[PDB]
Amino acid sequence: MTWYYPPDIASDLQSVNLPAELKGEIFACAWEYTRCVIPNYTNWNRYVAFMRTIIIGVIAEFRGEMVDVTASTSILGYDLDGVLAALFEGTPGHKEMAREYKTFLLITADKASERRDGELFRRYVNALAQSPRHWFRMRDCDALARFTIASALACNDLDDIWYTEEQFEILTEIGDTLYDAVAFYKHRAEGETNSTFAYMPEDLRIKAYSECREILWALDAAWARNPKLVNVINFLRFFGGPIHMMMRRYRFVEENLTIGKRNTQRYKALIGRSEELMFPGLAEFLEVGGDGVCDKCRYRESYGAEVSHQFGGVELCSECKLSWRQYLECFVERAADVFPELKT
Amino acid sequence: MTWYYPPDIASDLQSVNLPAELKGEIFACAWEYTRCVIPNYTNWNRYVAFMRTIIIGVIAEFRGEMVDVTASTSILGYDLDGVLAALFEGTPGHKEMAREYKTFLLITADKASERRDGELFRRYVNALAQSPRHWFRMRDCDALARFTIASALACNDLDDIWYTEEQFEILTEIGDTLYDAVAFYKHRAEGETNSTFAYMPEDLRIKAYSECREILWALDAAWARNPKLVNVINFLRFFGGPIHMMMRRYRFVEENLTIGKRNTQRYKALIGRSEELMFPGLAEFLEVGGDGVCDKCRYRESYGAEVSHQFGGVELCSECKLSWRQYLECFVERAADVFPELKT
Numbered sequence A, B: 001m002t003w004y005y006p007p008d009i010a011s012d013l014q015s016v017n018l019p020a021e022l023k024g025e026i027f028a029c030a031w032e033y034t035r036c037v038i039p040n041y042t043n044w045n046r047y048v049a050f051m052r053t054i055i056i057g058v059i060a061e062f063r064g065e066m067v068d069v070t071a072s073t074s075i076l077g078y079d080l081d082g083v084l085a086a087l088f089e090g091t092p093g094h095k096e097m098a099r100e101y102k103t104f105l106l107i108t109a110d111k112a113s114e115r116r117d118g119e120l121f122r123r124y125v126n127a128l129a130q131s132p133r134h135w136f137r138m139r140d141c142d143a144l145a146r147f148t149i150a151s152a153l154a155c156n157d158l159d160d161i162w163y164t165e166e167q168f169e170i171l172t173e174i175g176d177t178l179y180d181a182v183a184f185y186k187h188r189a190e191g192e193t194n195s196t197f198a199y200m201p202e203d204l205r206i207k208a209y210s211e212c213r214e215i216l217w218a219l220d221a222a223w224a225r226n227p228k229l230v231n232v233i234n235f236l237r238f239f240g241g242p243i244h245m246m247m248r249r250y251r252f253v254e255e256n257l258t259i260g261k262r263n264t265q266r267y268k269a270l271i272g273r274s275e276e277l278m279f280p281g282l283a284e285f286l287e288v289g290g291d292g293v294c295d296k297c298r299y300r301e302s303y304g305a306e307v308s309h310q311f312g313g314v315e316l317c318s319e320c321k322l323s324w325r326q327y328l329e330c331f332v333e334r335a336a337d338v339f340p341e342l343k344t
């Protein structure tokens, strides 16, 4: 197995205790991901800064104990704030994107470690299920979807382009619905907490892909001859399933070129650091939703024990399933309301 | 069904006898294809010129009688030489890319019409099977692979970038092998003449995808921080299977988000117009290979009668299968010989 990546990152992770062959595979993963979801760039330095955010994120998912965003010490030989500044300085969402990424590192590492049985992760998983709109916002951060939209703009020196909160909500809902519709079978086999059709109706998965893809084509056509905005469309289009064919980390080849088959002290200290570590509104999502808002849904005391061939989070009750069904079934009108260019 | 495409092409095909709903679908097809395989552009006018070459090509595949490149009259309300000049003027391969495209229109229309039982198509199909290297060169033109590499450079105002013949041969072999490995089952059901694994061994299809994809990653890494060359890589990567998920013309949604389940007078007149209508070397390919070079392979008197659930071209004999196997099995070394950056 031979790993391909630019030499700029070949001497990263100095004194990180992983074998050289594993660092090679991580660097390859970062480069492949970056080339797939930000396929164009003008700013090599920002591109490499993005690659390093993906390096850290891959290790956080693999061995959560290795990545502690709560500690002031270097992350994996990097200066996290420095890397984020190299990526985002002079761009409209720098401060919010640092919060987005640190949230992703906090939750991801907690999940890929012994902290998975902890109170932060327990409240996170409960808060995912409090409403379909909360789900899409939290899934966004978990997938770095708006982070990567922001990164795609930054990496093309588009330092003036930005979206409202509601616009990001719809753009990431498109990207995340597309990805999660395709990642469905993998996610179910692995006992995933963060998979859209663990919550949304299975009998609308195919239609959801089809509608998200069509609205993405309609947006693309409505943004024609502003080639700035193609970096946003391209992200959603290549992220939204196609990465399963392009990245060696997925199993397209292995499946024969087929697709388809209570101590609350740390938690309170982290809520206290919400402006630093949590995306805007997450502290309220965790405080309001962390114990489970609905008396009929099935919560668990902990989400650490890893289940298989079923989703590992909250099980929605009948009434919640219907509300989530109804939210999915008005996707087009929710999209058209924030992107009125779709009305025509 | 709603069609999305830029308004620049909305009034194309004036006085072309197709219903408005079908023109809409063609315009959508052209826009979707263009956005998928040339996902970045700087030159809107060249981008629209490319879209129009795809408009003409889609109609040529659908109703070959509607598109005659041999006649001096307008093609479908366009001036073909004008569109090609808008796309390619000032670029290194303008003259050769006009020949590439006119070949594609000649063969495609012949195939999608009554001329499919004709001597040109009979000699074309025989010439496909004369050697594996001939196959990849002819498949390239049939897929507009080097045409689209050239177009991807042009559409990004990269007017100085070019490849040797041998480099184009390997780049298109990568793109065409990737696409044909994925399009395998569709191609077989339709009785396709132009499908790589109708000729190359079925038992190497999975490995061929895997090796082409890896060499494409190795090239990508070897071309790092020359962001010019990402337009070439991106073409091959998105063309090489991912379009099956992104373009509404494919059936990803319809399959539930799954992948995997003798009058020689005209012929002699066209050989006489080879500098105009045929890519460099095709006239020799047709003259030398048109009657079938191997006495053991199975040729047909005509390839017009359309077969189903099997390939519709030449059936290679034992000895030819082995030579084709051996050519496929030395892909990496053939690639490394023309792109020595891969040696490291």
Ligand SMILES: [Zn+2]
Pocket (backbone or CB within 6 Å): A294, A295, A296, A297, A316, A317, A318, A319, A320
């Ligand atoms: Zn409930």
Ligand SMILES: [Zn+2]
Pocket (backbone or CB within 6 Å): B294, B295, B296, B297, B316, B317, B318, B319, B320
């Ligand atoms: Zn033979």
